[PDB]
Amino acid sequence: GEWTILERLLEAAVQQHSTMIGRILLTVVVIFRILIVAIVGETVYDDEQTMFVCNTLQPGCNQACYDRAFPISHIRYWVFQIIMVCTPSLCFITYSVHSRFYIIQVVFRNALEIGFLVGQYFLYGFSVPGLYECNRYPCIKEVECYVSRPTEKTVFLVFMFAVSGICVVLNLAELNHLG
């Protein structure tokens, strides 16, 4: 992934006036989200489908049950969330050199943070179990499948949920501050 283009864009997008809460929120976003996703998370989800196995002899059942158990990977959801959260801060380049803008940005950023947090709760939950039960064609009746590295993905889920809750609390604090 070409993270240096996003780095240079975020360097040119952090020149806008911000409050204390906004700078604490940017510090949490830079440290607890970007460096961890861009350094640690890529290799964890590397052998997700290679080391996914099911107890059957039916061709094509592994693909069906893997696609049914993990519709979207965690890492790609987090990368999309990171890109979308910083979008309101990237519209400053277009709107500047070319206080209502600040309020609109804050409102949109709060709505995005809450939407992504709720979507993360509904998509995944709080844990990744080590077994899965599958009843999708072409598999015959119900079969059982086994997952790769479930403990380290439960740890990743819990850590990301905690960081997103912190950023949501700071967003609501600043929203109350504006009034």
Spatial contact of 52 and 62, defined as CB atoms under 8 Å apart: yes
Select the binding partner of residue 39 from ligand Y01, a copy of itself, none (C-beta < 5 to 8 A, by kind). a copy of itself
Cβ neighbours around 90 below 10 Å, total: 14
CA distances from 176 to 55, 63, 166, 171, 173 (A): 54, 48, 15, 9, 5
What CA–CA distance (Å, rounded) separates 24 from 81?
19
Q: Closer to ligand Y01 at the Cβ: 108 or 121?
A: 108
Pattern 90-109, binding to ligand Y01, x per CB under 6 A?
Answer: -x--------xx--xx--x-
Spatial contact of 84 and 109, defined as CB atoms under 8 Å apart: no
117 binds ligand Y01 (CB under 6 A): no
Spatial contact of 54 and 145, defined as CB atoms under 8 Å apart: yes
Task: Enter the DSSP assignment of 53.
Answer: E
Select the binding partner of residue 101 from ligand Y01, a copy of itself, none (C-beta < 5 to 8 A, by kind). ligand Y01
Select the binding partner of residue 169 from ligand Y01, a copy of itself, none (C-beta < 5 to 8 A, by kind). none
By CB under 8 A, the residues from 40 to 69 that bind a copy of itself are: 40, 42, 44, 47, 49, 51, 53-60, 63-64, 67
Select the binding partner of residue 175 from ligand Y01, a copy of itself, none (C-beta < 5 to 8 A, by kind). none
Contacts of residue 97, Cβ cutoff 8 Å, sequence gap at least 6: none
Q: Which of 16, 36, 172, 175 binds a copy of itself (CB under 8 A)?
A: 36
Interface contacts to ligand Y01, rule CB under 6 A: 84, 87-88, 91, 100-101, 104-105, 108, 112
